[PDB]
Amino acid sequence: EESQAFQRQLTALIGYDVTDVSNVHDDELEFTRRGLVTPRMAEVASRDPKLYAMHPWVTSKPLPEYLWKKIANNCIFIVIHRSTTSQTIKVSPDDTPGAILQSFFTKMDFVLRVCGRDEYLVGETPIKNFQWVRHCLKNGEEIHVVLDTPPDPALDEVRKECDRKFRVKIRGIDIPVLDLTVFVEANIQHGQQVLCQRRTSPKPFTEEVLWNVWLEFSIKIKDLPKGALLNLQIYCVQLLYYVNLLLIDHRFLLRRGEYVLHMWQISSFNADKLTSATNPDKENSMSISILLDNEMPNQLRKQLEAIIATDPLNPLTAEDKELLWHFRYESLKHPKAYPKLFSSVKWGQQEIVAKTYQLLARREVWDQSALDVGLTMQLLDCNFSDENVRAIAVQKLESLEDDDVLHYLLQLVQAVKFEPYHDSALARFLLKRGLRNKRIGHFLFWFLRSEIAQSRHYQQRFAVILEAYLRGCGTAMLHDFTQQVQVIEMLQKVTLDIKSLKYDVSSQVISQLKQKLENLQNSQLPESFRVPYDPGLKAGALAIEKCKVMASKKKPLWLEFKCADPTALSNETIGIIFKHGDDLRQDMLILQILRIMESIWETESLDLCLLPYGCISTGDKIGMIEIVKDATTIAKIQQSTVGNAFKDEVLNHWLKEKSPTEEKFQAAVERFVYSCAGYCVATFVLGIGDRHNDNIMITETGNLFHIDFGHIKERVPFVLTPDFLFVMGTSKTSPHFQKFQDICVKAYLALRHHTNLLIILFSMMLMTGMSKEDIEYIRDALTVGKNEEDAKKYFLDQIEVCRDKGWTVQFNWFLHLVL
Ligand SMILES: Cc1nc(Nc2cnccn2)cc(-c2c(Nc3cc[nH]n3)nc3cccnn23)n1
């Protein structure tokens, strides 16, 4: 009654009913639900109530060199507010909020909260190590803080509670609505690698096809490893339908009995092809019926080290694998060899896997090695099905601080798609970290909710994990999630309703939007809600006056909100775009990679001023986008002076008229040089550089930024046009262009220092977000095998290609958009 009503609340928060049993052939999901109770309760019990409530956002990384240059006399200023009075206090970079509050007690307990945000500066951390402080220093802003009472931890209340050979009988296949022939392929898969394959005889493709054939495999029963899949595929030759079945279940028991599995349709490698889930659509999908009733020389060391040295994508030959295995104990001494070593394992052999587990018992070097995320990511991809192998990776992730978890959270959530079982160390890890920290927990919610909303292949698994999180996140957050979900669902209806009503925005359309938003305001739209892409901000009532439908292809919503926090230092509005038509999952993955690149450059004291805008995918081809204020499209700047032909002088003239002083114009040029170089390198490595200038924007303060990363003859490495080069002062070279080339090289080489990581993140992105030939682009782009000097020239060539191409590519883009 009360418990059943709480389940409906969770179902409304999740967007999927976890109690549903219409689409299962076992109890794995229910076993996982029950299995996650312990790790949930264990973290909820162990977390510090006060620190969990205030969720301080901190880093233990050293402050970069450019930020130390912006602080003089070893002194940082903080303006402390209280009701109607505010005072400035000189604070040393090492001062703890506990010690600073004592200064505002002697010079004439409470807590320091950031003005206009749900962000607190508390706990035993020096203020230099608070993220907000670092953010303020980055943009050159004074830190405004308020002295108020700490939030009550009671608000985070949690509600109480055998030598036989393997064989499979193929009975037949049937489709309600389809003179070609058809056959069934049966594979024993372990980590993408096919252990054994058997086919059936081709029969005429009809509404029902029956075989009643025993398919005897070469691999024995005992030789079957845990996490092995029975891949069943239907070829007409082209593949049409696929479905999977774990041969050994979540209880270590061999699979037996009759199975009627509804299969998936086909639109090379894809994460969706690994799924243990069956198609929920019974009425329309193809289904299959089955029956189960059962020390080393100098030369070799040099060869071994060459194998270990190679990139993650370089494939191992039989020779390479046999060498790695034979010398596994020397291979075990190199953490970088681990992925390649565990790919040399014959997993279809009981005695070998046993030796592999005996090998993992001697993890002295691995355990003691400094954490390499790139390496750790490798062991979590589709190439590895073994629980123990994968577990040693998740162990390495344990030492990541909350700051670093946020950097890899999205990819780590997507990495769950590669897990053979619903319950896994990785899932438990994501559960643990999300429950420990409110910020990780906030983004965990949305990332998991995103896939539930649009992935039939993985919604069931992710729903079990989200229910797990929500059952321990506390009433306070549960309330915050409820206000958020209601808002986006309301505004998605408005987004789709307006799009229905040529690319010209008429009078009658703009009126209808204002009408609907006025009707929602007075109705059931909550007074305030957290911004999904920025949980620090609380948005309030809609500023309908400033709301509009933009003159675009997909006709998105331009929505603006008042800040719910009265302590806000400015009367700025929170701007959000709601859009249907772009695949914002792809945008999410690119932007997250962009934020990883910003962290990579920070290690080498660089700030290339990227603007990776906030973006949350909320469903199928729909979601929200942060509005970057005071920004315009490069094409629109060309339109205002020219019309439809391009002039180099336009961009520099635009920056001048948007500048009040020369002092701020010089800052606008320097910001452009850095930000252009930033996107030039990033887009080239990712293979998303060749772009029309409609999808490239700039702010009034000079900051260039790319948008709309969905779905990506003369070609170009990146967009460096004569109007960009005119801002630098070149038509020839300039002190700004010399600075530009100096930044590009230093940035490109800095990324190349993390080659493996970027390759894995890329590889994973294509498998979870969007062939082998598509992945191999990044190897060439990062010039794997070449030295720094040789690589420095390579990118300097790419820059010279853009100057030799000029407007040609952009001109061709312009013609392409006119049919
Ligand atoms: C990050 C960002 N900032 C924006 N800010 C501004 C600010 N002023 C005027 C116009 N746009 C707009 C957009 C944006 C985006 N962003 C994205 C990102 C992904 N898809 N679309 N799409 C459109 C379409 C029409 C107009 N704007 N717009 N994106």
Curated annotation (Swiss-Prot):
Keywords: Angiogenesis, ATP-binding, Cell membrane, Chemotaxis, Cytoplasm, Disease variant, Endocytosis, Immunity, Inflammatory response, Kinase, Lipid metabolism, Membrane, Nucleotide-binding, Phosphoprotein, Serine/threonine-protein kinase, Transferase. Its main location: cytoplasm. Residues 549-555 are annotated as: G-loop. Activated by both the alpha and the beta-gamma G proteins following stimulation of G protein-coupled receptors (GPCRs). Activation by GPCRs is assisted by the regulatory subunits (PIK3R5 or PIK3R6) leading to the translocation from the cytosol to the plasma membrane and to kinase activation. Inhibited by AS-604850 and AS-605240. Residues 73-149 form the PI3K-RBD domain. Its EC number is 2.7.1.137, 2.7.1.153, 2.7.1.154, 2.7.11.1. Gene3D superfamilies: 3.10.20.770, C2 domain, Phosphatidylinositol 3-/4-kinase, catalytic domain, Phosphatidylinositol 3-kinase Catalytic Subunit, Chain A, domain 4, Phosphatidylinositol 3-kinase, accessory domain (PIK). One of its GO terms (molecular function) is ephrin receptor binding. CDD domains: C2_PI3K_class_I_gamma (cd08399), PI3Ka_I (cd00872), PI3Kc_IB_gamma (cd00894). Signal peptide: none annotated. One of its GO terms (cellular component) is cytosol. The modification Phosphothreonine is found at T755. The keyword Kinase applies. It comes from the Eukaryota. Transmembrane segments: none annotated. Residues 687-695 are annotated as: Catalytic loop. It is found in: Cytoplasm; Cell membrane. Pancreas, skeletal muscle, liver and heart. Phosphoinositide-3-kinase (PI3K) that phosphorylates PtdIns(4,5)P2 (Phosphatidylinositol 4,5-bisphosphate) to generate phosphatidylinositol 3,4,5-trisphosphate (PIP3). PIP3 plays a key role by recruiting PH domain-containing proteins to the membrane, including AKT1 and PDPK1, activating signaling cascades involved in cell growth, survival, proliferation, motility and morphology. Links G-protein coupled receptor activation to PIP3 production. Involved in immune, inflammatory and allergic responses. Modulates leukocyte chemotaxis to inflammatory sites and in response to chemoattractant agents. Belongs to the PI3/PI4-kinase family. PANTHER family: PHOSPHATIDYLINOSITOL 4,5-BISPHOSPHATE 3-KINASE CATALYTIC SUBUNIT GAMMA ISOFORM, PHOSPHATIDYLINOSITOL KINASE. This is Phosphatidylinositol 4,5-bisphosphate 3-kinase catalytic subunit gamma isoform. It comes from Homo sapiens. The lineage of its organism: Eukaryota, Metazoa, Chordata, Craniata, Vertebrata.
